[PDB]
Ligand binder design. Structure first.
Ligand code: SYM
Ligand code: SYM
Ligand code: SYM
Ligand code: SYM
Lengths: 251, 251, 251, 251
């Protein structure tokens, strides 16, 4: 009955360093929606744990050359963690190498941009090359465009790909600052856009959702914990706890 | 220089009868998001108008037999109205018979149901036959399921169709009541679900968005007003007026 | 420049018949806080007037069956009076049919009862059915309970409603005597409770204020006099005249 | 059979240092409404006690960061006192961490200001930014505004918060002086306003009560003294002793 190693990633308001005038220890060092979720999972299912930040700082994507995965997905594959509790998108390509619990939140890719412009959709971005746009490198949004067969999205990936180092960023925070400082549109997940626009009155979502997906807890393929976590999540959902947590962290 | 005839439909909070102690006349008899939109359109483009409620009380669907359309769509086809300003979904099948302005709002089909249940997605509904589910008859949501080739949605339509008279309702309002008084789940548009859940704390959206679409102003095919209205809408969007209108009527 | 018809209602110490060994005429026939107020309004704004007692002897409520109003509210609606100067509560439902000046006095609903009992709140009354309680029929207090969604108040209305003819009275004076003669608690406005308890040492207020409201001068909707009266009232308030009038009539 | 430690706070006329030429000892060093109440409680329930002044000088509020409470509330939580007998407001947020006896007095938040001004309500204050307004830091009134969802009160808090160090004071006394020496309106409890206006003829309450609440004796959660104290208070209330105590200290 050893403590489980839970990998996650810094992402407001799901996971962040808790601030305090005095020293913090162990799990108390972190806070956020996913941290509250993890706590609930541990008491419902009866396990102890330790929080680890994904070492390469990535969510997870497959390398073009060697086909190897990185990020949290890879840490689960290599059994460097028992669980991945973070805003981790459940995707078909990931389901091939790791397992996911049922979703604890639903969302979709959308566009973050400055308000007061004539850009009103992805098509408005794809039809021009002046305004640059991108996404978080090695994340689910990037992979969506990289694998899309939809004309507009295919051309958008061709654009991003050709300017990979200039338009792909290392985090949502970096993408947001890019939007606030230059003529740049950012492809990010709707749930995070909701949080951002609520705090940056000069920003807004552009258009609707480009796709639909959900966040789930990740486990190494075959892990006996996956089905147990799904039971816990469904219980939290039904009792309205997940709704309560969303309200608390989004305000 | 005659006034334009604008067809619409009662649907809170887009269009409703304005309440007052003193007799109301003309366009002042109605109010709502779409009524405010119509007003802005008239002063920006320079036209006067009169509001008409779609005679058959339907949004618009194609008949299986004669293949003819009904509702607002049909009123436009037969030139019984110059414009249709309402929460009218822009869809491929409709675009074949009428024209649409660019969208003034984005949304997607989703599920409305009571809180505290184990139903967490459409799949949860489709895999069972105990709790019934449906949509508004002759609307875009019903048509979506009727034309879908996605397994889950395909069997969901088989279900609805076989119990058409018992599960398909005449309005969102009827559906909401059906949900509050019986084991029934309702397929409706996210923007309306948003309005409903904020006023019915026992209800909640189930899962995420099943599709993505937008509302646009409808015009008879070939109408010279379509492109002009698109220009007006984009201006209202860019200046933040559409966002202001949404906040005013949803709150 | 005809004299205005001012409707009011007998209610100590706002309005009462002035006593005198010799015959009294015109406006000299009445006295009280509201009569002093009316006089001030007439000289500040420059108008003459005649005092009329509301014919049906009611303050004003909407009928359940036909939705018609009665009391002073109805006399204003039917233009049977230019102004209503009395302890008339400014309420949302009334604002729909008549206009009110800014408040000239603030108050709240409370409970009048005998002292020396274990009843200490509305909850103490609502949890039992032995001690009866009520309010003035067709007044603002009755309407407050009739429209309240607050559990305790909802159950209290269910009680009063089921015993309407036995517990609802025609006036505060009738309610007070009911309290002095039988095991009965009376829901009345705090300002009047203040006057009563000061003269009936055996009575007392129970609990705090159940709501907050104010008294205002009523006028038919759209009356040009409403804003003028507000100016007069605010001036009287600022100079301390309203405070002086309260002290004079409450002692 | 040890004496109980009772925490309280200096606040006229509930608690103050008794003045005398000869040295005073023990409980005789204090006096006031709450000191008389405490005395009656001790003889009715059969306990001895010692009075302690809350060390941090605060009533009690929850910290935004660590979420910890301070003031008398915190002294009770940490069992640094057996009882808190003072004008301690019974509130929902406090009831989550400590217990309260039934109320021994009812009141509501209101506005204290100079007479002869055009300010007649909270709205009059909230619609302007010239004259400043505030409340006692870390008290129930401040918390009310900080948690309110009522538009007017919401913007009033935005105002106070943005000028926290300049408008939030350490005591009612500081607030009263702030009102007598500058263009400042003070949000304080009605029962205290009542005491102040009777001794400061230039001051007056503005508008009516903004909310309704009561003062109760606080105890650590689960304390066996809570229900016993409620019984004592209800007895004092029924016999008219609480009314007598109010008259004695307010006059
Ligand atoms: C940053 C985010 C990561 C995304 N939640 C994932 O799981 O890879 C994105 O791709 O937009
Ligand atoms: C009621 C609604 C109608 C839909 N807005 C339309 O344009 O047909 C629906 O189909 O869900
Ligand atoms: C008697 C009184 C009337 C109340 N002042 C009104 O305006 O209807 C009450 O309802 O308590
Ligand atoms: C000073 C007073 C404290 C208040 N009686 C309390 O219990 O926190 C206030 O908040 O207005």
């Amino acid at each position: 009955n050893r403590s489980l190693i839970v990998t996650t990633i810094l992402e407001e308001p799901y996971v962040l360093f808790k601030k305090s005038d005095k020293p913090l220890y162990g799990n108390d060092r972190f806070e956020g929606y996913c941290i509250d979720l993890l706590r609930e999972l541990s008491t419902i299912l009866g396990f102890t744990y330790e929080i680890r930040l994904v070492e390469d700082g990535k969510y997870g994507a497959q390398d073009d050359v060697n086909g190897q995965w990185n990020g949290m997905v890879r840490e689960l594959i290599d059994h460097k963690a028992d669980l991945a509790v973070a805003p981790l998108a459940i995707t078909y390509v990931r389901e091939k190498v790791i397992d996911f619990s049922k979703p604890f939140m639903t969302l979709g890719i959308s566009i973050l941009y400055r308000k007061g412009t004539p850009i009103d959709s992805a098509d408005d971005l794809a039809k021009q090359t002046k305004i640059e746009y991108g996404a978080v490198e090695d994340g689910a949004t990037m992979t969506f465009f990289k694998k899309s067969k939809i004309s507009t999205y295919d051309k958008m990936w061709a654009f991003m790909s050709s300017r990979r180092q200039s338009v792909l960023v290392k985090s949502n925070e970096e993408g947001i600052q890019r939007v606030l400082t230059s003529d740049y549109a950012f492809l990010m997940e709707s749930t995070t856009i909701e949080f951002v626009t609520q705090r940056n009155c000069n920003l807004t979502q552009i258009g609707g959702l480009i796709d639909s997906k959900g966040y789930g807890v990740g486990t190494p393929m075959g892990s006996p914990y996956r089905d147990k976590i799904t039971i816990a999540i469904l219980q939290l959902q039904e009792e309205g706890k997940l709704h309560m947590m969303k309200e608390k962290w989004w305000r």
